[PDB]
């Protein structure tokens, strides 16, 4: 049972699997058995993982760390399994893992300098490990010696470096000391300039000097200087302006294309301007055609991030340009949103293939994966839907409907959920629509055919109301569905919303009694669910039914689980024989708080 989902997790796509499975595992574990089972098993899988390392082991292990978290045993199993799993990316894996596990500085600093200098003798991910760990002048000196040994990977070294530089942010003097020192290598000066210009007069001066120098080994210096220039960003601004324009026009046209374009983008972010804007428009044209020849618009992204400007001419020019160019659509979405309104509304009206107003024709069978560069058509499905969500932000209805039907099944979730939320926030009102309601509930019961249906029910319940009211034959079908699928608790709340006018409460009471006589442990779980249902129901009565039921629950107070608790809770909530039960139960639970404490809270 528990072992099942355990192995399922550990084995682990893999990531999310192990994640959710382990989450549920430790959660449902609910703290001679518990201790034993948990410790033994989990630690066995800690060794098992540390040996097995792919990353199934790793992932699930770190998950177990977080779960066991949510100090002695902590750091114990931490260093144990981590070092057992640590001398690809498993380095950074256990790095971050143990990092948050510890602090999210002794044995920490110990093993830090130890293993770091260990792999540093010819280290990096270990440096960054202890960096994030010790993150939120031992750091100063450590980092000094480290950066020495390693630099002259240098990436992860730079990670630990910027991490320390951050952590300190007196020490500014030691930092500026090491700064002038290194200032007195490619990767070295790269990381240096980066962290520095991110987080001083002649600092920035000599920066601009060496940087603009190397500006006029390629991509290395490209990114180094670029990152430096933006971070350090009037005299600075003007020197940066000149060097920027220079290198920009240099690279484009001549790799360095986007990079200098990126540095310029960051400058604009820091920042006729319309000349540079039209130049940026041509550059964006060629860049779109660059990713197109490739197939990157990130420049357009950062440019949008810079400001709103250049007016509808250049604005809509580039709009049409990039719109005709995978989250670039999303980036563009955010951009156009941040822009103004005109082009926003425009692209909103685009909707691609195949949608527009007018008209009441060409709806259902799209049906037409019209290729362009074409597809496997499914990309494009996840993306059809994503894009749909974005554009959203009868024709609407019909289109979205047919769509949702088609791409929900099959396979992957998507459409149904999407169009669900969509039409949800779309219509009603929609003052008088038969079709809206009908199709809505239609898709609803359609959903009755997993968790999709659940969250769908959430959205639906949100929408509600007189719709679901008219439903009530079909909503009764929905009530059946509610009963059936477990867990089934999900349905409960939904059902609760359905009250007033309906004939429900009869059937409700049915279910109630059913649970009552049902009076095993899983049946107790479902029972609790039912209790909750009663709570949420919050309709009224059946008075004495409620009384006797409550009595049954009172019997059920003994042993079991917090089910009994919440049972009393909800019971009370709605809304006397009171005393005897009350006193006995309560006082007990008080005495009995240790250890349930669900029980005590309930009692309250």
């Amino acid at each position: 049972n528990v072992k099942a989902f355990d192995l399922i997790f550990t084995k682990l796509n893999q990531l999310e699997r192990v994640a959710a499975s382990y989450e549920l595992k430790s959660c449902l574990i609910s703290l001679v058995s518990t201790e034993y089972f948990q410790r033994f098993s989990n630690d066995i899988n800690n060794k098992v993982f540390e040996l097995i390392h792919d990353s199934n082991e790793k992932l699930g292990g770190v998950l177990a760390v977080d779960t066991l978290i949510d100090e002695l045993p902590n750091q114990t199993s931490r260093l144990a399994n981590y070092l057992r799993v640590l001398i690809d990316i498993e380095v950074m894996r256990a790095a971050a893992t143990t990092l948050g596990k510890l602090a999210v500085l002794t044995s920490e600093f110990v093993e830090f300098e130890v293993k770091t200098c260990i792999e540093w003798l010819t280290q990096e991910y270990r440096k960054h490990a202890s960096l994030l760990i010790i993150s939120s002048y031992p750091f100063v000196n450590s980092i000094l010696d480290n950066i020495w040994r390693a630099l002259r990977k240098l990436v992860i070294r730079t990670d630990a470096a910027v991490t320390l530089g951050k952590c300190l942010t007196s020490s500014l003097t030691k930092k500026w000391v090491q700064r002038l020192f290194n200032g007195c290598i490619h990767g070295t000066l790269l990381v240096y300039r980066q962290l520095v210009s991110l987080e001083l007069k002649d600092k920035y001066e000599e920066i601009y000097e060496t940087t603009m120098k190397h500006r006029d080994n390629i991509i290395i210096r490209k990114e180094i200087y670029a990152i430096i220039p933006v971070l350090a960003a009037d005299p600075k601004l003007f020197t940066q302006k000149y060097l920027d324009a220079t290198m920009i026009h240099y690279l484009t046209l001549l790799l360095s294309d986007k990079g200098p374009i990126l540095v310029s983008i960051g400058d604009i972010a820091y920042h006729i301007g319309p000349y540079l804007d039209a130049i940026v428009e041509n550059l964006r044209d060629g860049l779109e055609t660059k990713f197109k020849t490739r197939k990157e618009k990130d420049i357009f992204y950062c440019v949008s991030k810079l400001a709103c400007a250049v007016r509808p001419l250049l604005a809509k020019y580039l709009n049409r340009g990039l719109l005709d160019a995978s989250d670039h659509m999303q980036e563009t979405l955010l951009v156009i949103c941040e822009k103004i309104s005109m082009e926003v509304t425009v692209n909103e009206k685009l909707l691609n293939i195949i949608c527009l107003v007018l008209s009441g024709e060409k709806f259902r069978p799209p049906g037409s994966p019209t290729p362009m560069k074409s597809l496997s058509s499914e990309t494009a499905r996840a993306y059809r839907d994503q894009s749909l969500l974005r554009k959203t932000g009868t024709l609407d209805a019909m289109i979205l409907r047919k769509a949702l039907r088609m791409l929900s099944d099959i396979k992957p979730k998507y459409s149904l959920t999407e169009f669900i939320r969509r039409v949800i926030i779309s219509y009603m009102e929609h003052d008088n629509m038969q079709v809206r309601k009908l199709a809505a509930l239609t898709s609803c019961d359609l959903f009755v055919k997993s968790l999709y249906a659940l969250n769908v029910v959430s959205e639906v319940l949100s929408k509600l109301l007189t719709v679901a009211i008219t439903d009530p034959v079909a909503e009764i079908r929905l009530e059946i569905l509610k009963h059936l699928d477990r867990l089934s608790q999900p349905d409960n709340t939904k059902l609760l919303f359905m009250a007033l006018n309906d004939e429900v409460f009869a059937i409700q009471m049915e279910a109630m009694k059913i649970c009552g006589r049902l009076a095993v442990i899983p049946s107790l779980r479902k029972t609790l669910i039912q209790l909750l249902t009663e709570l949420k129901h919050s309709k009224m009565t059946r008075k004495k039914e409620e009384c006797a039921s409550l009595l049954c629950t009172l019997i059920s107070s003994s042993s079991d689980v917090t089910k009994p608790y919440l049972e009393p809770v909800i019971e009370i909530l709605l809304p006397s024989a009171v005393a005897s039960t009350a006193l006995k139960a309560l006082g007990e639970i008080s005495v009995v708080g240790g250890e349930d404490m669900l029980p005590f809270l309930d009692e309250l």
């Binding site: 055919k449 079908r477 059946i480 569905l481 059936l484 699928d485 059913i514 006589r517």
Partner: protein
């Protein structure tokens, strides 16, 4: 016959309790006494029934389950759709026997609800009488025809 509804029902609870507890005798007497009950109000019982049924003393046990259920039912639309999904998924051993038992079960208990079938139309993929009565219905009603599938029901 009927008494009490309750005296039965709790005793019925003891019974299903035993039922959950692979002795073929279990399954046999199970489906048997199931049919014996017939009407009416046993509900949680009926779920456990659908539940115990969802376990798939063997396949044929589960088949007979589906049958007896259909009979005594001829509501829960809940457990209906539930076990519907169950078997129809099991639907790509019993697969023949299952095809019949489930087809029949459906026709029996169903429909007036096009939903179930419509889904099950898809879910089927992969068987006639079911389909026949289904489309027939889709056009317009028709009684009986279930006698074909099963018989007793022995008084």
């Amino acid at each position: 016959l009927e008494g009490e509804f309750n005296p039965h029902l709790p005793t019925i609870l003891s019974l299903f309790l035993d039922v959950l507890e692979n002795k073929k005798v279990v399954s046999v007497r199970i489906l048997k006494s199931l049919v014996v009950f017939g009407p009416h109000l046993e509900e949680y019982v009926h779920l456990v029934l659908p539940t115990i049924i969802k376990l798939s003393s063997g396949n044929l046990k589960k088949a007979a389950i589906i049958t007896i259920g259909r009979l005594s039912k001829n509501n829960a639309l809940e457990m209906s759709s539930r076990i519907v999904q169950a078997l129809v998924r099991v639907l790509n051993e019993t697969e023949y026997v299952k095809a019949t038992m489930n087809t029949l079960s459906l026709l029996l208990l169903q429909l007036n609800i096009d939903f179930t079938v419509f889904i099950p139309v898809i879910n089927k993929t992969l068987t006639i009488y079911d389909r026949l009565v289904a489309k027939l219905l889709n056009n317009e009603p028709l009684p009986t025809k279930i006698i074909i599938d099963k018989d007793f029901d022995l008084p």
